[PDB]
A paper describes a structure:
Several three-dimensional (3D) structures of fHbp have been solved by NMR and X-ray crystallography, and despite sharing amino acid identity as low as 62%, the structures of the fHbp variants 1, 2, and 3 are well conserved and consist of 2 domains.
To date, more than 1000 distinct amino acid sequences of fHbp have been identified, and they can be divided into 3 variant groups (v1, v2, and v3). Within the fHbp variant groups, the sequence identity is usually above 87%; instead, between variant groups, the sequence identity can be as low as 62% (14). To date, several anti-fHbp monoclonal antibodies were described, but probably due to the high amino acid sequence variability, the majority of them are variant-specific. Here, in order to better understand the human immune response to 4CMenB and the possibility that immunization with fHbp v1 raises crossreactive antibodies, we present a structural and functional characterization of one of these human antibodies called 1E6 in complex with fHbp v3.
Author numbering:
A (entry chain H): 1 to 136, 140 to 222
B (entry chain L): 1 to 212
C (entry chain D): 20 to 90, 94 to 152, 156 to 194, 197 to 220, 225 to 262
Write the structure that this text describes.
């Protein structure tokens, strides 16, 4: 029962760098072969490099040798990967993986860190309410999260308390270069007169936080 | 060996045996590991050291390695075995970890699911900001191929439509989104706007009018 | 486990509770082994050459990263330290992945070899002898081989089989149950369908065996480490 947990999403200009941190919950990453694997959109698993504790060093994939450093700091109790001179080809999810031996299979994994490298500007979202309609059999209301960049945007409802019946759809990358998503809640049509519904939208890339009330159509 | 060749895709009927291949120039000489990965989730080691099976892994899963082929073998396949399967080795000749390309395991026999469509008109606020967005959401359907079409009154509309590629969600079904971006003038100068979703020869049409 | 290096000997552990690595430490050298985020270094000559076998899992190959050093100071080899453990025996192998550069000392060339460098537990006295055995046989990158070896003591004969390796399959043939200098029960035989082999018996009642076999293929000799129990 050990659980690696990672440093949280990132946005980078090309030619910048990134440091991704990993720590374990029911254990430690220290003196453990930590390993960094990335996954780029539409592709699969790719090795970056990893710490070998015995030789007190790290190995790196021939594709990153020169611009990457995989280290660990026992004071903070955390492992770190640092990838310099970023390109949009470095956009990917980065997983830290622990294994008991330098050649042992990765039995524990972190949850990934989305690193988006781009030269386009970071843009926070415009959050609009989508009033309940019930056309489609319950009622549905939600939040349109329009023209942001880049991913990720997280969404919850009523500060995480409303989670039954909610569906956040995957983002569209529209032709402008901006993302849009919708988060929608199927609710009982009767309680509309007495329940409040707030969507909490969080775009860490732009440090934007929006709580939006979704009230029923006036009419 | 150093290069691992995984087919990119394998299809299997439920309850039959799925046989996932990982090819290597004398891959027998290496001891491979297998990971399963599900949509939106970190990988999980399903086999290690060739034909070793860790803690939580069902005994339907098992692995072997001989000549130039390692094989992850799943007996009696469930629907929740749909997943990407990566094979890995450590290449001493290069000091590299090597992953195969991955095999997308498709489980056949899954029943057609029709899409729930819900259509939202542009928000009052959004019009107060001199934009208008029509939102057409499509969930819970199978197979994952939808056609979205927009109408203003009866006339097709192609400019301003952004439609997502369908995304495999948690249950093996799919979700998709279409957005029709409008000028509020455009929005208000038409009796209605219509979202038309076609899946497996069946059509769902929602219609909303500026006269809300 | 890592505890095998960093925990005392609690009696109430699984099987063989400790083993000694003096046979894997180079003459006037070091052996350092690490896994699971613990490390321990094993200086040659010391009494502190014992590994807490008790902590590992039984009937499975346990693995440790390792590195051989001597005397400033130079590094000899590195790779994976492998140990198979039953209740009264254990076999240990070295999977050398890099070695010392024969030219550039203070440099390590890549080189894979496999050598059996341990054999211990509670040997059965050749006089205290009172069965069939099936177990594991493993060489480098090959830990799913299987061994079945049966003999009766009254004939005092020797014959068993090795299969399920990814490399060939070997015959453990026509071997006399003898007694080594330590008064211990110890089989020795030849081996073809390609070299020799040697077993050793362990356990209160000779419940287990553990030993090693060699196979001549062309010019390279593949060492295999075998071990099994009765039932």
């Amino acid at each position: 029962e050990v659980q690696l947990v990672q440093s949280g999403a990132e946005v980078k200009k090309p030619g910048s760098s990134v440091k991704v941190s990993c720590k374990a919950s029911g254990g430690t990453v220290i003196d453990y072969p930590i390993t960094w694997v990335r996954q780029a959109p539409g592709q699969g698993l790719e090795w970056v490099g990893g710490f070998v504790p015995l030789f007190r060093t790290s190995n790196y994939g021939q594709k990153f040798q020169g611009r990457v450093t995989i280290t660990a700091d026992k004071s903070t109790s955390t492992a770190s990967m640092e990838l310099n001179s970023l390109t949009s080809e470095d956009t990917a999810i980065y997983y830290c993986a622990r294994g008991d031996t330098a050649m042992g299979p990765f039995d524990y994994w972190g949850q990934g860190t989305l690193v988006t490298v781009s030269s386009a500007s970071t843009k926070g979202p415009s959050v609009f309410p989508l009033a309940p309609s019930s056309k489609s059999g319950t009622a549905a209301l939600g939040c349109l999260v329009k023209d942001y960049f880049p991913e990720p945007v997280t969404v919850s409802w009523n500060s995480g308390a409303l989670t039954s019946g909610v569906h956040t759809f995957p983002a569209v990358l529209q032709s402008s270069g901006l993302y849009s998503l919708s988060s929608v809640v199927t609710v009982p049509s009767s309680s509309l007169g007495t329940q409040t519904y707030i969507c909490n939208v969080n775009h860490k890339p732009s440090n934007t936080k929006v709580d939006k009330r979704v009230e029923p159509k006036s009419c | 060996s150093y290069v691992l060749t995984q087919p990119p895709s394998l299809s299997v009927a439920p309850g039959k045996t799925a046989t996932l291949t990982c090819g290597g120039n004398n891959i027998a000489g290496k001891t491979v590991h297998w990971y399963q990965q599900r949509p939106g989730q970190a990988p999980v080691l399903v086999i290690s050291y060739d034909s070793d099976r860790p803690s939580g892994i069902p005994e339907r899963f098992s692995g072997s390695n001989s000549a130039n082929t390692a094989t992850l073998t799943i007996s009696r396949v469930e629907a929740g075995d749909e997943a990407d399967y990566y094979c890995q080795v450590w290449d001493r000749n290069s000091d590299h970890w090597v992953f195969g390309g991955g095999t997308k395991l498709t489980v056949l026999g899954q029943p057609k699911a029709a899409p729930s469509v819900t259509l939202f008109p542009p928000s009052s606020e959004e019009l107060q900001a001199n934009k208008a967005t029509l939102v057409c959401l499509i969930s819970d359907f199978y197979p994952g191929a939808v056609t979205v079409a927009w109408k203003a009154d009866s006339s097709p509309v192609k400019a301003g439509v952004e439609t997502t590629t369908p995304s495999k969600q948690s249950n093996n079904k799919y979700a998709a989104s279409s957005y029709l971006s409008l000028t509020p003038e455009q929005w208000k100068s038409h009796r209605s706007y219509s979202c038309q979703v076609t899946h497996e020869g069946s059509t769902v049409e929602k219609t909303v009018a500026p006269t809300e | 486990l890592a505890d095998a290096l960093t925990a005392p000997l609690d009696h109430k552990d699984k099987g063989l509770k400790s083993l000694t690595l003096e046979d894997s430490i180079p003459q006037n050298g070091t052996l350092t082994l690490s896994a699971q985020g613990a490390e321990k270094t094993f200086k040659a000559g010391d009494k502190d050459n014992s590994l807490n076998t008790g902590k590992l899992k039984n009937d499975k190959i346990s693995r440790f990263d390792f590195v051989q050093k001597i005397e400033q100071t130079i590094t000899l080899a590195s790779g994976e330290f492998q140990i198979y453990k039953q209740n009264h025996s254990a076999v240990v192998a070295l999977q050398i992945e890099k070695i010392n550069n024969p030219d550039k000392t203070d440099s390590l060339i890549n080189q894979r070899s496999f050598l059996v460098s341990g054999l211990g537990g509670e040997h059965t006295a050749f006089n205290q002898l009172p069965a069939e055995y099936h177990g594991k046989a493993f060489s480098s990158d090959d830990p799913n081989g299987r061994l079945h070896y049966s003999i009766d003591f009254t004939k005092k004969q020797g014959y068993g089989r090795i299969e399920h390796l990814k490399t060939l399959e070997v015959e453990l043939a026509a071997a006399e149950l003898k007694a080594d200098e330590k008064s211990h029960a110890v089989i020795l035989g030849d081996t073809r369908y390609k070299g020799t082999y040697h077993l050793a018996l362990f356990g209160d009642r000779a419940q287990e065996i553990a030993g090693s076999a060699t196979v001549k293929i062309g010019e390279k000799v593949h060492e295999i480490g075998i071990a099994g129990k009765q039932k």
